[PDB]
Design a binder for this molecule. Sequence first.
Ligand SMILES: CC(C)(COP(=O)(O)OP(=O)(O)OC[C@H]1O[C@@H](n2cnc3c(N)ncnc32)[C@H](O)[C@@H]1OP(=O)(O)O)[C@@H](O)C(=O)NCCC(=O)NCCSC(=O)CCC(=O)O
Ligand SMILES: CC(C)(COP(=O)(O)OP(=O)(O)OC[C@H]1O[C@@H](n2cnc3c(N)ncnc32)[C@H](O)[C@@H]1OP(=O)(O)O)[C@@H](O)C(=O)NCCC(=O)NCCSC(=O)CCC(=O)O
Lengths: 249, 424
Amino acid sequence: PEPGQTPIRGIFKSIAKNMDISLEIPTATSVRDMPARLMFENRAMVNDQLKRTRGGKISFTHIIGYAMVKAVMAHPDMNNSYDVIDGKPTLIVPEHINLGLAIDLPQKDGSRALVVAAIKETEKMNFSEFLAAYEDIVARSRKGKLTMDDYQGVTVSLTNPGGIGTRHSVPRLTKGQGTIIGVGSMDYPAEFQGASEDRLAELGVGKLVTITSTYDHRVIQGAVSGEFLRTMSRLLTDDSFWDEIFDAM
Amino acid sequence: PEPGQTPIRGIFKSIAKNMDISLEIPTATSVRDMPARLMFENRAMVNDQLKRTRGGKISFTHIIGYAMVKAVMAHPDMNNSYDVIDGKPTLIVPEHINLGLAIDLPQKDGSRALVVAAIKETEKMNFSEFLAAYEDIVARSRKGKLTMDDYQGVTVSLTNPGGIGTRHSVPRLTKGQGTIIGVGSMDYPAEFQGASEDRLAELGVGKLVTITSTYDHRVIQGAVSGEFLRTMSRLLTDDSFWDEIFDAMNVPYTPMRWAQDVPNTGVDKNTRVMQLIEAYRSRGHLIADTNPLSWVQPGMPVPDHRDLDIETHNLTIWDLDRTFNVGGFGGKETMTLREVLSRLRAAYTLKVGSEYTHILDRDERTWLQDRLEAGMPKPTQAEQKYILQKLNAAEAFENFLQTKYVGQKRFSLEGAEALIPLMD
Ligand SMILES: CC(C)(COP(=O)(O)OP(=O)(O)OC[C@H]1O[C@@H](n2cnc3c(N)ncnc32)[C@H](O)[C@@H]1OP(=O)(O)O)[C@@H](O)C(=O)NCCC(=O)NCCSC(=O)CCC(=O)O
Ligand SMILES: CC(C)(COP(=O)(O)OP(=O)(O)OC[C@H]1O[C@@H](n2cnc3c(N)ncnc32)[C@H](O)[C@@H]1OP(=O)(O)O)[C@@H](O)C(=O)NCCC(=O)NCCSC(=O)CCC(=O)O
């Protein structure tokens, strides 16, 4: 690359500014690893049904995203944020659960940028509605028909560095939000990446997913964040949770 | 310890100040666990070559350090830093990749301090150059002859808390840098630390290393950091990466190849092992270190010697520690594949290459086989000195004629002086 000093401008300047503002948020992180076997099996069944129907195709982020929404409803404290109004610390309780998706956008110029588009009012959706709303945001982001309203009102964020193969991450929390959830790689642990399928199948080793919760510690306690991740882990292996998805699809 | 309040001064004061400055950097961390089996195997081979050469000894930090440099070249964004020039946010793109090593220095006073010494211009080095530059910095740091220039110009840092046994860490990023890479413990997971080697070998559990990337989020995106770690993971198990290192360190054997364990189905592995033994006894000479020159004649057809690779016999690295019946090979009924390979290589691929399996008489073949596999007996010092005298006489005679009769044909033996001790 060509050395030298180039001023930061455009979307990148706004990103840099927001990261500087985020320094004023005291954050803590909870990390939990969850079995992913049942997620692999049941997603395959759903995709098989969609194939015969000639519909679409769900991803792991759809399932985890929906499970996350359910877990926030079970633990509403995770949706709260902090602010200083009139010079007093205030606990903001949002009216809806607006799920922010971290969407990586490799631009045609060459550089890549990350944006957080909101899926609004997720607390009043089923899986079918959630999937439609999810795909709408993603579809528009690629073609680049996102309005300013799409970027506003985010109450909780979801990021998926696990696609690249990152085991887990400790992301930054943006101002005006309570927590951000990171989804790690859904793969065998590194110590099993050389083992044969026969030996793994014999022993009964399953794939895992690591989920992180980075939250504002001024308004969210560590126990609440822990219980939130526990709920998510339970949902992903719950009969009722998967029955709901199967009925919807 | 003695209670009280003591002002911080010296190097410790500068460290404390720098850590306070680092609070203004919004950092995020990516964590990735990588298989370390191939790193253990191939490092052993390199160190074995250095032992015979009587050279040095490479470490895991050398390999990971070099792989990290390669990964930064593949992802240059990781080398960029942030600064405010004239009151405007600026993206600084450095001209070189200066790798900072976190060196722990237990001082003679009693206290220990950490310093970050720079290896400069790593983007224009091979492994040999990198290793030399690495060792130079480390050597000088211990004796304490580091100049001020060594501490300046760091663009990216590498820290290794894994030596102590820390699984992974979330370190702090210093101002003027884009990212810092942390290397965790290269060991079995805690859940396997009580398991027997037999059960681990049977299942095919490998050691892992956890690498972290802590980066300035203002200039480096999470996707870039993720892809950086992915590249590092690929390099550490890449054939090309290890071929480059082997060539630099002059290792004659083919590196062990990353491959999945194979089931003991069809042809038994005991069969395969004894086929490997016959392969080496028959064709081991094809890869023997018999040529004094590193020379291959262009236009001479290179024979195929795939029969000497364990892959050809449907064996893998995961079979190395498994025991097989070798039917009296090496005067033992049972042996590990590792030991079988060691004995075969020692007998057939070192300085003596033998062709005897073509001999039809079994007593002849056995006589030769027993002596070749027993190996050369260690000569006495008197015998060694006698060999030197003969070598000296051979060379000195040739050199004397060259001096006294420069323009006279003699057909010198120079380059083949070992003929004289051979005939003797
Ligand atoms: C909009 C989304 C979220 C949509 O993604 P989706 O998962 O729905 O689809 P996709 O990525 O196209 O999926 C492609 C394939 O990857 C698989 N896949 C997806 N997530 C996975 C995971 N965690 N583990 C394993 N496999 C995964 C899918 O099943 C699919 O497999 P099949 O082909 O079999 O279907 C996309 O843009 C995305 O993935 N963005 C990544 C977010 C990102 O870049 N974040 C920056 C990190 S910022 C951060 O965390 C800071 C800290 C740090 O990490 O450093
Ligand atoms: C200059 C270096 C880096 C050179 O180290 P090298 O690895 O080249 O050699 P060495 O340490 O002498 O190696 C001794 C033995 O340990 C092994 N070894 C080295 N690193 C290893 C690892 N990650 N896992 C397992 N084994 C390891 C070597 O193979 C070798 O085994 P053999 O004998 O079989 O060859 C040295 O000073 C060092 O190791 N420093 C430690 C770095 C440090 O203190 N960082 C501060 C953490 S600050 C930080 O991270 C903040 C966050 C936090 O951790 O809390």
